[PDB]
Amino acid sequence: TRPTVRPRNDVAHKQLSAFGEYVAEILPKYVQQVQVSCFNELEICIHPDGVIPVLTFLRDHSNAQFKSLADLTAVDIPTRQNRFEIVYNLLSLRFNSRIRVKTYTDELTPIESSVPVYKAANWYEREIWDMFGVFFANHPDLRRILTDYGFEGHPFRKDFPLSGYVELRYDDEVKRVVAEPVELAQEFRKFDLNSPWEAFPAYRQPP
């Protein structure tokens, strides 16, 4: 085949598609959309009420057995009404397969903690709360994990500035480290890099 072109795997594509329909048939109450990517990754998009039921089924069902929570993160998309996309990446050692489960939320809508299903989720959900400000209901110990104590804001939101709002220095008069509004000797230089010509016709959107 073409030496520079990634080869397609049509068997895995068909297997993942069939299992995606399988999941959607069993949990119609929650599954909103199922898709398989051209590089063979299965995504299950669900209503946020289905977090615990869907994850529990995927972990415990005999034909699923997704015992490992590889990763749990969020994505901020300000143009959406529910700006926060919550992404669960699961691994099945029994069937040597991965699956992605996605749901959504806004700044004020809690999501149910998945710690009951995966104890791995404990710190991942603290990170989502810290970095995105998404609240997780019934989390055993929800608090910041990566930011400074007393830090204000959620810095992975698309509208949080790259350099933040405050900066630190040691002040000799008060004999301690103090926080002050950020000033930069050199402002970060924004580059406009996007070409004005379309690159990928296959992804064109209706006018």
The footprint of other proteins on residues 9-68 (CB under 8 A) is 12-13, 15-22, 24-39, 41-43, 45, 47, 49-50, 53-54, 56-57, 59-65, 67-68
Tell the smallest beta-carbon distance from residue 84 to other proteins (Å).
11
Identify which of residues 89 and 113 has a Cβ nearer to other proteins in the complex: 89
Nearer to other proteins, 34 or 113 (CB): 34
CB-based contacts of 131, cutoff 8 Å, min separation 6: 74, 146, 147, 154, 155, 156
CA dihedral 150, 155, 157, 162 (to 10 degrees): 140
Binding to other proteins in span 59-118, by CB under 8 A: 59-65, 67-71, 73, 75-82, 87, 89, 92-100, 104, 107-110, 118
d(CA 141, CA 169): 31
Number of residues that bind other proteins (CB under 8 A): 150
Task: Give, rounded to a whole angstrom, the gap between the first and last alpha carbons of the chain.
Answer: 36
The two tokens of residue 134 are 């998404």
Give helix 10-26 / helix 51-60 axis angle, nearest 10°: 120
Q: Which residue in the set 55, 84, 101, 154 belongs to the binding site for other proteins (CB under 8 A)?
A: 154
Amino acid code (one letter) for 126: R
CB of 123 to other proteins, least distance (A): 4
Q: How far is CA 67 from CA 1, 40, 70, 93, 94, in A?
A: 36, 20, 9, 7, 9
Closest contact distance (angstroms) between CB of 59 and other proteins is 8
Q: Rule CB under 8 A: say whether 181 interacts with other proteins.
A: yes
55 contacts 118 by C-beta, under 8 angstroms: yes
Among 9, 101, 122, 140, binds other proteins (CB under 8 A): 122
Looking at 84, 113, 140, 205, which residue binds other proteins (CB under 8 A)? 205
Rule CB under 8 A: is residue 194 a binding residue for other proteins?
Answer: yes
Q: Is 140 in the site for other proteins (CB under 8 A)?
A: no
List the one residue from 9, 138, 140, 168 that touches other proteins (CB under 8 A): 168
